[PDB]
From a paper:
However, it has been established for the H1 (1918), H2 (1957) and H3 (1968) pandemic viruses that a change in the binding specificity of the virus membrane glycoprotein, Haemagglutinin (HA), of avian viruses from a preference for α-2,3-linked sialo-saccharides (avian receptor) to a preference for α-2,6-linked sialo-saccharides (human receptor) is a prerequisite for efficient transmission of avian viruses to humans. However, surveillance of human H5 viruses has revealed a number of H5 mutants that show enhanced human receptor binding with HAs that contain other amino acid substitutions in the receptor binding sub-domain. We have carried out structural studies on the HAs of a number of H5 mutants that were isolated from infected humans in Vietnam and Egypt to explain differences in their receptor binding properties. None of the substituted residues in the mutants we have characterised make direct interactions with the receptors; they appear to have their effects by perturbing the biochemical properties of the receptor binding pocket.
Introduction of the double substitutions Ser227Asn/Gln196Arg and Asn186Lys/Gly143Arg, identified in viruses isolated from humans, indicated that the weakened avian receptor binding that resulted from Ser227Asn or Asn186Lys mutations alone can be partially restored by the second substitutions. In the case of the Ser227Asn/Gln196Arg combination, avian receptor binding decreases ~50-fold relative to the VN1194 wild-type as opposed to the ~1200-fold decrease resulting from the Ser227Asn single mutation. The Ser227Asn/Gln196Arg mutant virus has the same avidity towards human receptor as that of the Gln196Arg single mutant, suggesting that increased human receptor binding by the double mutant is mainly brought about by the Gln196Arg substitution. The Ser227Asn/Gln196Arg and Asn186Lys/Gly143Arg mutants of VN1194 have increased binding for human receptors but reduced binding for avian receptors. In both the Ser227Asn/Gln196Arg and Asn186Lys mutants, the stabilising hydrogen bond between Asn-186 and Gln-226 is lost, either due to loss of the asparagine side-chain as a result of the Asn186Lys substitution, or to an altered Asn-186 side-chain rotamer influenced by the nearby Ser227Asn substitution. The human receptor complexes of the two VN1194 mutant HAs also illustrate that the bound receptors are in close proximity to the substitutions Ser227Asn and Asn186Lys, whereas the Gln196Arg substitution is located 17 Å away from the nearest atom of the receptor. Thus, as with the Gly143Arg substitution, the Gln196Arg substitution is also likely to enhance receptor binding electrostatically, consistent with the observation that both substitutions increase the net-charge of HA by +1 and have similar enhancing effects in virus binding assays (compare Fig. 1c and g).
Residue numbers in the entry:
A (entry chain B), B (entry chain B), C (entry chain B): 1 to 162
D (entry chain A), E (entry chain A), F (entry chain A): 1 to 321
Write the structure that this text describes.
Amino acid sequence: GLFGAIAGFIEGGWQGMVDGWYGYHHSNEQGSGYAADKESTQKAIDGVTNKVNSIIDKMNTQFEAVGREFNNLERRIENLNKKMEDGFLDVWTYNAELLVLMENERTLDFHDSNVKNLYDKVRLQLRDNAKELGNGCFEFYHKCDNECMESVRNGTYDYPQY
Amino acid sequence: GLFGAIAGFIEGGWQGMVDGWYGYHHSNEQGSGYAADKESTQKAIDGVTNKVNSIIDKMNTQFEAVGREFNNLERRIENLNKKMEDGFLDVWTYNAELLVLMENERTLDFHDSNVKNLYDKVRLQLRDNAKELGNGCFEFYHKCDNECMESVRNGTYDYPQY
Amino acid sequence: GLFGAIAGFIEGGWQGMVDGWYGYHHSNEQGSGYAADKESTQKAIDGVTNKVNSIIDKMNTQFEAVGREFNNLERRIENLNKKMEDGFLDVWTYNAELLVLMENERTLDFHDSNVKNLYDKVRLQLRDNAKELGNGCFEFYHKCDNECMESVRNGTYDYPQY
Amino acid sequence: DQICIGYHANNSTEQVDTIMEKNVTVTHAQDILEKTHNGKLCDLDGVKPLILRDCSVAGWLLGNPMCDEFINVPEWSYIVEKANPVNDLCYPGDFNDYEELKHLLSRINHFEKIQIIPKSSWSSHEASLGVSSACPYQGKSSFFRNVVWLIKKNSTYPTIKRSYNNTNQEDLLVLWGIHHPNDAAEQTKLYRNPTTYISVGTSTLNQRLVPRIATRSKVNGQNGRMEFFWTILKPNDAINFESNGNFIAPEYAYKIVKKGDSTIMKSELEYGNCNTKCQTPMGAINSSMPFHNIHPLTIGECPKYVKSNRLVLATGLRNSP
Amino acid sequence: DQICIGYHANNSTEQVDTIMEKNVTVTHAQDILEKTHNGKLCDLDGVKPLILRDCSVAGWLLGNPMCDEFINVPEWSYIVEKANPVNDLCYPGDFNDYEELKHLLSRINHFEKIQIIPKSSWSSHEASLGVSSACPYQGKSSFFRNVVWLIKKNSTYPTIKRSYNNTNQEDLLVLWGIHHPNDAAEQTKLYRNPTTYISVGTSTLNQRLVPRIATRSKVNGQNGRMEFFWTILKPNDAINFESNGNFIAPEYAYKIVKKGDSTIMKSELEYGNCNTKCQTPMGAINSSMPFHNIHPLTIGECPKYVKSNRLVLATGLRNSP
Amino acid sequence: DQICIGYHANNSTEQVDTIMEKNVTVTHAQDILEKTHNGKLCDLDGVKPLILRDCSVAGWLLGNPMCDEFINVPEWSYIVEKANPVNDLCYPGDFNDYEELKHLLSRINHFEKIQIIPKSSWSSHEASLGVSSACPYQGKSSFFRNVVWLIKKNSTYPTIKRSYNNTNQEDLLVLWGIHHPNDAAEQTKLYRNPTTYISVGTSTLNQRLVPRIATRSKVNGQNGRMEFFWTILKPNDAINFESNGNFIAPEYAYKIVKKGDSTIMKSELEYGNCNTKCQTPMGAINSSMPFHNIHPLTIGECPKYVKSNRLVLATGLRNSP
Ligand SMILES: *[C@@H]1O[C@H](CO)[C@@H](O[C@@H]2O[C@H](CO)[C@@H](O[C@H]3O[C@H](CO[C@H]4O[C@H](CO)[C@@H](O)[C@H](O)[C@@H]4O)[C@@H](O)[C@H](O[C@@H]4O[C@H](CO)[C@@H](O)[C@H](O)[C@@H]4O)[C@@H]3O)[C@H](O)[C@H]2NC(C)=O)[C@H](O)[C@H]1NC(C)=O
Ligand SMILES: *[C@@H]1O[C@H](CO)[C@@H](O[C@@H]2O[C@H](CO)[C@@H](O[C@H]3O[C@H](CO[C@H]4O[C@H](CO)[C@@H](O)[C@H](O)[C@@H]4O)[C@@H](O)[C@H](O[C@@H]4O[C@H](CO)[C@@H](O)[C@H](O)[C@@H]4O)[C@@H]3O)[C@H](O)[C@H]2NC(C)=O)[C@H](O)[C@H]1NC(C)=O
Ligand SMILES: *[C@@H]1O[C@H](CO)[C@@H](O[C@@H]2O[C@H](CO)[C@@H](O[C@H]3O[C@H](CO[C@H]4O[C@H](CO)[C@@H](O)[C@H](O)[C@@H]4O)[C@@H](O)[C@H](O[C@@H]4O[C@H](CO)[C@@H](O)[C@H](O)[C@@H]4O)[C@@H]3O)[C@H](O)[C@H]2NC(C)=O)[C@H](O)[C@H]1NC(C)=O
Ligand SMILES: *[C@H]1O[C@H](CO)[C@@H](O[C@@H]2O[C@H](CO)[C@@H](O[C@@H]3O[C@H](CO)[C@@H](O)[C@H](O)[C@@H]3O)[C@H](O)[C@H]2NC(C)=O)[C@H](O)[C@H]1NC(C)=O
Ligand SMILES: *[C@H]1O[C@H](CO)[C@@H](O[C@@H]2O[C@H](CO)[C@@H](O[C@@H]3O[C@H](CO)[C@@H](O)[C@H](O)[C@@H]3O)[C@H](O)[C@H]2NC(C)=O)[C@H](O)[C@H]1NC(C)=O
Ligand SMILES: *[C@H]1O[C@H](CO)[C@@H](O[C@@H]2O[C@H](CO)[C@@H](O[C@@H]3O[C@H](CO)[C@@H](O)[C@H](O)[C@@H]3O)[C@H](O)[C@H]2NC(C)=O)[C@H](O)[C@H]1NC(C)=O
Ligand SMILES: *[C@@H]1O[C@H](CO)[C@@H](O[C@@H]2O[C@H](CO)[C@@H](O)[C@H](O)[C@H]2NC(C)=O)[C@H](O)[C@H]1NC(C)=O
Ligand SMILES: *[C@@H]1O[C@H](CO)[C@@H](O[C@@H]2O[C@H](CO)[C@@H](O)[C@H](O)[C@H]2NC(C)=O)[C@H](O)[C@H]1NC(C)=O
Ligand SMILES: *[C@@H]1O[C@H](CO)[C@@H](O[C@@H]2O[C@H](CO)[C@@H](O)[C@H](O)[C@H]2NC(C)=O)[C@H](O)[C@H]1NC(C)=O
Ligand SMILES: *[C@@H]1O[C@H](CO)[C@@H](O)[C@H](O)[C@H]1NC(C)=O
Ligand SMILES: *[C@@H]1O[C@H](CO)[C@@H](O)[C@H](O)[C@H]1NC(C)=O
Ligand SMILES: *[C@@H]1O[C@H](CO)[C@@H](O)[C@H](O)[C@H]1NC(C)=O
Ligand SMILES: *[C@@H]1O[C@H](CO)[C@@H](O)[C@H](O)[C@H]1NC(C)=O
Ligand SMILES: *[C@@H]1O[C@H](CO)[C@@H](O)[C@H](O)[C@H]1NC(C)=O
Ligand SMILES: *[C@@H]1O[C@H](CO)[C@@H](O)[C@H](O)[C@H]1NC(C)=O
């Protein structure tokens, strides 16, 4: 993707993380596990929901055909009528298909961006106190227990203390 | 936004910076203040201007209706005429509304990108000689007077000297 | 561009690199030269190819006019017919021109992104063992011979060893 | 001790297309195109359609005797005619401005039939021998039930001068016709007078039909032809008939009681005993999807027709193997 | 000592919509939709429109005596007719191919009226008693001013054989009519001859009108009807009239001096004494916006009509609280 | 010792436009708009078009004697008529429903001409003096070759009663006409009978033409007029002609052997001796581009017409100085 995170420097997703779209995994002496980041996940949910409703809304005022009969000596205007109805259906078909293609691209990139930004939020907290592993992970120089870990998810990780 | 800067790791904008869209704030013993980055600001201005004129230009060759009368026994072709004129207005209305929605998204992201890129331009200069605070700011290890600061805005910040 | 690499922190492209779209240049005691990154280049090629064929495909089901004669007292329906054919050609002309404009923007950004991501792939490997010069380049602290260099292009650069 | 950033994955096989890549597996997706229907013709908001079955709109309005099922039809939501209904004009001929009339019915939900010129009231002309073997009913010769084929009485066709006045509140659909016999002998036999006419007048209408007498091919065994005409009689306006032969007179006309949304749908289907909020010529649609790809001509609260086979939005992210 | 990167903020409350979010406050925005007009009918580049007021296009061209205001109108930019003008055809009847003629006027900016058949030149027929109480002027009976209702002179209607030749450089709009009396007695009273005709010929035209005599409803107290016809007479071509009764002859015709851009606009408004470069049926537009949402039918250098209530582009960036 | 990331550059001057910037030089680009044609009218998949040259479609079908080149034309891919062909209706007149007929030819690739009423078979009427100086052939007076101008034989025009039956498998295009003489004397000279008619009947058709006799302008030195009519005769159906004068009878008719894709193209060009898979009125297109901007009306396997001057996709990246 454009932002380099999803299927980039983070090779793959987590079957183990079930309660959100993005989040953290920790490993320490007490154990390991996953934690969804509720803020960025909820932002994602709202974005994608609004997008869908936006698409559905734009398209609901759109051409609708009606039947018109013509006789054997009104072929020109019958043909005019056929080419006019087909003309608009092609236009709307094109519009729908393209919108979906384009907005799918943007949706996938949006997710990539949210992950990249979450990775950066944490990197900017840890600074020199953790080794950046190159794969989405951060190895701490100090021992970091469950409360230390929560503080990193908090945003309230006291860098100077460590 | 996609690039993580605007209303991201930079929480908010500056009422104090009036002479540009992006720029610097400095704080040292001599005092503090704002300085617009003229290059990236001017790039932004040109981009957005071209975009607007591009939009206005695309839309100026577009369907325009004309009146046609029909009598009491030409209802089919009258209806054909009504559905044809309305058909195109819906198409153009959809085009206009969508273009604006889409291009607004891109415009906001463009600004986010310019800020992110400016932040990186400075980060790449300072390197190990400043602490990256995590909020758009850089705290220097050496004392950095007004001429030092200007050199950072210059692009000509002598890293080795410090 | 949006991602800051192309004509950003990397000032310009390389006439010298002929066998790919993105890649590496190395300089050491044994000499210097260019090496295309085949993975990211091939990804770029596939993306752009699919895009083109996608564009060509969307547009091939589209309005096509046919001749219809009308006499001196069928002017209204003749005019209806002219305005209907012109109406659709304007719509398709607009669609084609816009799609190209929009997709050109995205194509240029795509390339910018691939370069930025390649730069990051290498940065994340080197870590503290090289100085990040600020211009696309990495100066090593250790001496780095041709096999060392290949290992950086490999992805298999043993950080701990150095 | 370490902490990692990451993203969701699951067992989803749902795919979406993009401009640069096709068949990208994602964790979540939303189909927005309706591809299924029930295959039936249904009531539209509980209001049953008029299903003409084997009758055409002309056979229904004129009263083709094989179309007695539609002698008094209630209000309808839409009308369903076949592509080539067998029971059209039993007696061969034409229907003037037929397509402009059908277009009028797309805006009509209800007719009330009323008698404007009683059959009994033709005292100087014979009004019960106007019957043809081309229009049979229960084995006997009959004719269009809403019009009267007047022929000479005791070898005389005195000039007809009749007039109906639209006193009732509605607009009225009045229908009549002219007979085009095969030859001069048939003309004299039926109407005596060699040369004849029918003049019809309203506030707007001012016509004068003359029979064209020519040799024709038999159709349902008839050399003659009937040309049918119509007009809408505005309220408080009167229609004037003058004729000396060949006149197919109205007995019944239709009050237009309900205007609004309707359509004439072409379909070989019959009634399905269902209800629905959206109907197509090949079946009804029950869905909240923004789009469908079943058929362009719909009636009701419908999704938007597109010609796609597939429209699927990504909601989730790229799913990893 | 520290340095920070940042971006502009201000007191702007301007909002723009995006696909993923609505009502995003931005520092700067550009409205591109024009929503206001002046509410007036205006000159178009200093060229005043033809405002028919209570006259219809037919009442104007035929010379309905209540339409003397338009006896000689200058060049116009556009024409403004009402939806239901009262002064149409004072004497009831029809206007053949009326809508095809109106369509011709959308391409016409100026007429010069000229006399083709002098009223005085009818020496074998009476040309001053062709007047009706249905077409009153200053209390007296009158008639359409551009045509002549010829009636018998001393109980004779000799066959009329007249011919005008388009010597002048322009195309010429010629108008004429036929009278459809109520009955045979009225026919004989006015024209003597029981059965009549009017034949009209040009290089392309070859018609033969016959009066249809029928009982009709009164409209403005008239049982008769007038059917009006027209043709464009090409330069250097001649029109041939032959008739033995019922003929409504042309006195005046219209030279087509200016072609170009024009339109027939439907509006209940009157003249506003303004100038503008863009006019709609509900008012004029003065703006440099690419779009407007006032009305679809415009004339001039106009923005593009869309049906939106709001179109606002972001220029600035997301404004922070 | 250092390593650098970077990207391609080259000597390309190709430019593409974007929304935010115009004329961006890129390393690679793909033109997708075809701007060139060969300037010729060509065969379409080896099937030569019917190039009427100076003949109009009417002059071809009726058999204008100046149109002998098209006396028996093979199957065509498309038809090419000029804007104002000189050889139309040598004898002035009209062609009823002409445009509806042309529309029929857009779906026709081949006619086979056949004789339905032999010229020799007119034994009670004169069928060889129906010739005019307005329709000359090799200096002598002639006439439309596919129809017969019947005139009186030994000062008698007995009523004509003829009938053709479509036994052959195809649909048949039958053409006929009526003569509108200048005056009563010309009428009596040619046909004796003062008042005449032509009645034509099929299963669907039931008409009765009467000549309108009026003074007209000369066109190619003729005061008379010919009105031509047509119909499609379904297989196994018969057409009945009855007339007592003024009848322009059919000798030849056209079997419709091939339906399908065709068009009537307006162009002043002539045959170019080329082949192509896509043809326009100004030349043929040989390209694999998705779009072209040459002309809207194409026939064949064509790119899509747009009105642009330029459509170029970026493939490569921004090229640096
Ligand atoms: C089909 O039949 C109907 C019903 O018969 C015809 O409608 C009627 O036609 C008559 C004329 O034949 C009209 O005029 C008479 O009645 C009016 C009524 O005036 C007022 O009062 C009634 C209530 O009774 C009200 O409905 C009306 O709206 C109106 O306000 C009389 O005024 C009129 O006599 C006039 O008196 C005026 C004042 O003294 C004079 O100025 C006039 O010159 C005139 O002398 C006359 O007696 C009816 O109004 C009308 N009725 C209805 C219910 O519509 C219809 O015309 C017919 N169609 C055709 C084509 O023939
Ligand atoms: C309505 O009225 C107008 C005006 O009267 C009619 O137009 C005129 O019609 C006459 C025939 O009735 C035409 O023919 C005569 O004049 C031509 C003129 O030829 C040249 O010279 C004039 C200048 O005087 C110029 O304008 C022309 O363009 C042209 O170059 C004579 O040649 C012609 O006589 C011919 O001589 C030829 C050579 O000897 C012969 O080959 C011919 O066989 C023939 O004998 C004749 O005298 C006028 O040309 C024409 N005038 C104008 C100004 O248009 C119009 O026809 C009428 N309409 C209807 C429907 O009747
Ligand atoms: C133009 O000319 C053609 C050719 O002459 C006309 O078509 C023919 O018209 C006649 C009537 O004039 C038709 O009816 C006769 O033939 C049928 C044939 O029936 C079957 O057998 C033939 C094979 O020979 C087959 O092609 C048919 O498809 C069919 O299966 C006779 O049945 C019919 O007599 C009937 O017998 C029935 C059984 O006893 C009775 O129920 C009927 O009441 C009736 O007595 C009669 O002899 C031809 O069928 C028809 N031929 C063809 C090849 O189309 C055409 O009508 C004419 N057009 C016009 C407008 O006049
Ligand atoms: C996010 O997480 C950090 C680390 O888990 C939170 O800090 C801890 O917060 C708890 C909850 O109140 C504190 O509990 C308090 O402990 C003191 C003494 O130990 C006791 O006197 C109080 O009654 C109370 O139970 C805990 O001390 C504190 N510890 C550390 C090391 O930070 C933090 O509150 C969270 N912040 C946010 C914004 O979510
Ligand atoms: C951007 O800013 C830096 C730092 O402010 C600039 O460096 C300074 O530039 C000034 C302007 O010329 C120099 O002034 C010179 O000073 C010397 C001796 O002090 C004097 O002999 C000259 O006559 C002149 O006045 C100043 O020395 C210099 N100082 C430092 C520490 O850099 C730089 O020029 C700017 N560069 C760009 C690209 O904008
Ligand atoms: C990418 O490049 C690195 C560095 O060039 C590769 O490592 C080198 O790979 C070669 C190829 O097999 C090794 O060759 C072997 O050498 C040993 C002893 O020197 C010999 O016994 C074997 O027969 C063989 O020739 C080489 O040792 C090795 N050296 C180093 C310092 O890494 C690596 O294989 C490449 N990896 C990928 C994924 O492309
Ligand atoms: C993307 O996947 C679709 C759906 O699986 C593929 O289309 C199907 O291909 C299979 C196997 O070749 C066929 O049996 C089906 O008939 C196809 N179904 C449909 C609806 O098209 C498609 O080939 C894939 N596209 C690409 C570009 O890889
Ligand atoms: C976005 O803001 C608009 C404009 O303020 C909102 O629409 C208005 O809502 C107010 C308060 O509910 C109403 O009184 C007005 O009638 C609305 N005006 C218009 C022009 O719509 C809108 O509700 C907001 N939309 C969203 C999605 O939050
Ligand atoms: C982008 O480049 C195009 C093509 O070179 C420019 O258009 C040409 O401008 C030259 C020099 O002014 C003219 O002589 C040509 O007539 C133009 N050709 C075409 C096809 O337009 C254009 O001016 C440039 N556009 C911008 C915005 O800089
Ligand atoms: C996929 O996973 C879900 C668990 O959330 C499970 O319920 C479902 O049965 C699985 N589906 C398939 C096809 O394996
Ligand atoms: C439509 O079908 C859905 C099945 O998803 C059902 O829940 C609903 O009740 C149906 N409604 C009607 C009116 O048939
Ligand atoms: C917003 O700020 C500007 C200062 O640039 C000031 O002039 C203006 O009055 C302010 N507007 C409001 C509504 O406060
Ligand atoms: C249009 O209105 C603007 C107000 O912004 C004014 O400046 C301009 O002069 C007006 N022009 C005309 C022709 O009315
Ligand atoms: C550009 O470079 C290529 C080398 O790949 C060369 O073959 C070509 O001639 C050059 N074109 C121009 C115009 O200099
Ligand atoms: C079309 O032109 C191309 C030139 O690029 C040529 O290779 C090809 O053979 C041509 N085909 C035809 C059918 O003319």
